[PDB]
C-alpha cells in the first residue's frame, strides 16, 4: 500500500502479514457473506493493484467465484479502454496484469494522482457484489415467516436477504414499512397490527416472543 512518510511524501509499504492473514481467514470462514465486502475495503486502504492481486491470489477454494471475479475485471478493463484510449495506463495496467509495481507507484503518487488502486478496487467490489448475490442461500421471492418460526429468526433472514440482494435504500425502506409485517405468520401478523403504526422493530420483536 501507499502511505505518506513523516516528511509528507507518498511512499510504499509492502502488504503486511497481519493484513494478509486476517483477509485470508475472513474469506475462508465467511465464504461470500455480504460483510466480506466492507471487510475487503477496510483491509485494502491505499492498496496498489499489486497488493490487490496478492489479496485475490491468496484466497483458497472458491475458484468458481474467483474465476467470475476475473471475468468482471476483464469486462471493466475493456470498458475503461473504450472510454480512455510517464505513459497512460490501459485497462490491464489498472488490473495490474501488464504493469509493474514501479509504474503503479508512479501513477498513485503523481500530483495530481491517478489512483489506479481505487479504480481497480471498484472493479473488484463490483465483482464481489455479483458473487455475494449469487451465493446467498436466500432470495427475494421467498421471504415469509414459517408457521412455527420464531419472529427473530424470520427477521434475520429478511434482513440478510435484503443485504445480499443489494436492495436500494428506497427498496429496503419499502420492505421494512410493508413486508416485514405483511409476510409474518398469522399469529405474529395479528399481534403486529395491534401495535398500530410507528412500532419499532424492538417493540415488534418483544410483542412476538
Amino acid at each position: 500500500p501507499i502511505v505518506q512518510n513523516l516528511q509528507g511524501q507518498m511512499v510504499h509499504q509492502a502488504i503486511s502479514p497481519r493484513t494478509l492473514c486476517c483477509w485470508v481467514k475472513v474469506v475462508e470462514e465467511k465464504a461470500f457473506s455480504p460483510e466480506v465486502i466492507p471487510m475487503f475495503s477496510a483491509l485494502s486502504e491505499g492498496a496498489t493493484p499489486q497488493d490487490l492481486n496478492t489479496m485475490l491470489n491468496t484466497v483458497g477454494g472458491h475458484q468458481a467465484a474467483m474465476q467470475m471475479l476475473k471475468e468482471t475485471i476483464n469486462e471493466e478493463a475493456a470498458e475503461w479502454d473504450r472510454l480512455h484510449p510517464m505513459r497512460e495506463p490501459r485497462g490491464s495496467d489498472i488490473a495490474g496484469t501488464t504493469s509493474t509495481l514501479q509504474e503503479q507507484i508512479g501513477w498513485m503518487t503523481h500530483n495530481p494522482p491517478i489512483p489506479v488502486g481505487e479504480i481497480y478496487k471498484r472493479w473488484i467490489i463490483l465483482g464481489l457484489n455479483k458473487i455475494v448475490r449469487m451465493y446467498s442461500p436466500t432470495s427475494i421471492l421467498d421471504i415469509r415467516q414459517g408457521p412455527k418460526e420464531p419472529f427473530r429468526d424470520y427477521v434475520d433472514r429478511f434482513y440478510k436477504t435484503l443485504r445480499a440482494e443489494q436492495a436500494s435504500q428506497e427498496v429496503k425502506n419499502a420492505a421494512t414499512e410493508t413486508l416485514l409485517v405483511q409476510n409474518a405468520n398469522p399469529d405474529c401478523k395479528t399481534i403486529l397490527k395491534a401495535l398500530g403504526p410507528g412500532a419499532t422493530l424492538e417493540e415488534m420483536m418483544t410483542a412476538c416472543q
Copy 2:
C-alpha cells in the same frame, strides 16, 4: 481512530486490521453476551464515526439486531437535532453518513473539541444494551439450580443472567442476598442454610463441591 503516538501526540490512523479481526471474531463467537459491550468500548478507543461504521458494517449475521441498532441510532440522532438545531454537526454528521472524515477529525480535534466519536459511541452502546437485554431474556427469577446441576454451573448461569439484564449494583446485591440461596436445589439449599448469613460466594462454593 485518533490515538496518541509514543511521543504523546494525537494522530489519525485508519482502523487497524488487528482491531477489525478481533472485533469480527468476538461478535461472531459471543453473539450478544454482555461482555461484548466492554469489548466494543476497548476496541473503539478514539474511533471516528467512520471507524465506528466500519465496525458495524463488518458484523456478519445478526441482521435483526443490526437493524434494531440502526433504529436506535436513528432515534438518538433525531433527539440530538431537537436539542441542538467550522459548521455545527447535525445528527447524521455524528452517525457519519453526511460528513467527511476530514470534518469528523476537525470536530474531534478542535479546541474545545466536539467529540462526535464519543457521542456516536454512546448511541451505539445504548443500542447494544437493548440487544443484550433481548437476546438473554430469561428472568433472574427463573434461574434455579437443576436437581443434578453442580453448584458452580448454576452460579455461573445466575451471574451471567444478572449481567445480561444490566442489573444496578443494588439489584445485584439484593438478588445475591435473596435469590441465590433461595433458588438452589434442596440438597445445596440445606447445606447453605447451615452456613448461615454473611457467607461469601467462596465459602458457599466450597461447601457445595
Copy 3:
C-alpha cells in the same frame, strides 16, 4: 498501560485483549493463566485491568468471587491508609479517573495503583485456580489403566495449583509419586532403585 518511549500512556492494545480473552476461555483457570495474566498486564492502569476482567466471557461464578476478593482487599487497604490519596476503590479503578490513575502512577514518589490492583487480582486468581482444582495431592493416584505420563501430568498440575514451593514439590516427588502409582508401575519403579530421575521413571513405565 504506561510504557517508556519517558513514560507514556497507550490504551490497551487489541492484540493483548484478544490473546487474553482467548487464553482465559480455552484454559479455564488452569494454573498457567496466572503468569500469563502477569505478562499480559505489564504497566497496566486500573482501567486496563478492569477491561481485562470485564471482557472475560463465562466463568461468572469465578469473576464474582474475584470481585469479592477485590472488595476485601480494598477495605483492608482503607484500614491501613485512611493530588489526593487513593482509597481502596480508587485502586480498583471504580471511583477514579484514567487521569488520576496516571497521576498517581507517575507521581514522584509513585503510588503504583496498577501494581497494587494487580496483586489483589492475583490473589483472587490464586483462590479460583485452587477451587477449580480442588483435589489434594494426597488423593492423586494412578488409575489402573492410566498411562504413567498422564498420571504424572495430573500429579504436577495439582502441585502447581496448590502453588507448592520447590522444596514441597521435591518432597512430594520423592515421597508421594512412586507411592501412588498403580501396582504394575509401582513395582517397576521400586526395581529402579533410589536416585532415579523423572525421565528414567517415565521411560521405565511407558
Copy 4:
C-alpha cells in the same frame, strides 16, 4: 528480513496456513507475500517450522540441492583476491544459507550493487513448491467431469482449482475454458448450457444450472 528478525505474527500465520491448506496452489503467493525481503536464514526458519508434510519438505530440500549445484556450475568462484568494502562471492550453499552467516547474507543483500541471495533462494523454493503443488493435485484437467448429481458450482470449483494446480498459461486456461468446461458437464447441465449459445459468461452459465 531487510534488518528485523522474522516477526511472530508472520511465523504464526505462515505455520497456520501451511497446516490448514496443505499444498493447495494459493500457498505459493502466500509464501511470497509472507517472505518480502527475507534473508536465507528467515527462509530456513519458515521451512523448518512446517510440521507434517515431511515427504514434501524432503522433496523441497532435493530441489534446493539441484538448484544450488546448478548455480555453482554457472558461477564458480572468480579467482583472485577480494578488495576492501567488497566481500566474497556467494556459492550455491551460501544462497541456501547453509554455509553462510547472517552477517554475510546481509552484506550481500545490502551491498551496492546488491547480490540478492534472499530473492535467489526464494526462486528455488518457489520452484520446489510448484512441483509439490502439482504432485498433491495430480488429476488432469481432462479427467475433471461433472458428477451426475454434482452441483454445477462444485464442479466448476474443481475444474479451476485443477487448472491452477498445473500452472496453466493464460492461453491454455482460455483454451480449456472455451473447449473443456461445457464439454465435461453432466448431460442435464450440458444441455442447458448449449441452449445458452456462444458468448455466455461463466456467471450466466452458473445461473442457468443452479
Copy 5:
C-alpha cells in the same frame, strides 16, 4: 528481549503453538525463532506459561538443573549456573552480563540448555523407532513417507543415519506393490520420482 519486555504477540503465538503441537519436532525451531534476543527472564516467562504437559516441564527443569551444575563445575560479578537459568539473578544483572563487553550471553546459554531439554522430550513423546515404520498394505505411499520422515526428525538422527535410512529402509519397508515399483526405478531415484511412481 534485547530492552523490550516480551511482547504479547510473541507470548500468545508461543502458547498457542505448544498447546496444539504438543512436542512435535517443529516446536524447537519455533521456540528458537520466538526467543531471539531473549533474557533468562523472558525465557522463564515462556516456560511458565505453557499449560499442561507438566511431566515434560518437570523433566525440562531437571535438565536445566543438570546443566547449571555442570556450568558451575567448569566456571567456579560472574554468573553461577542458577544466575543463567534466571532463578538467582535480577533482570538488571542479566542485562549487565548480556551487554557487557565482551558479553556473557546468558540468554543464549540458558537457550541451549532449554533446547537440550526440549530435544529429550521430543524424543520421548515420539518413541516409535524408524525400524517399526512400515507402509501399511493399503496406505498411500505419501502418508507412509510422511510418517517415515516425521519419525526420523523426532529421533534427531545424524545426517549419516538419515542417509542410511533413506537408502535402506525407505524402499525396504514399503508394502510389496510399492516396493516392487520402486525396485524397477533403479538407483539414483529422487524422492519426487519415487512418489510419482507410487501414486
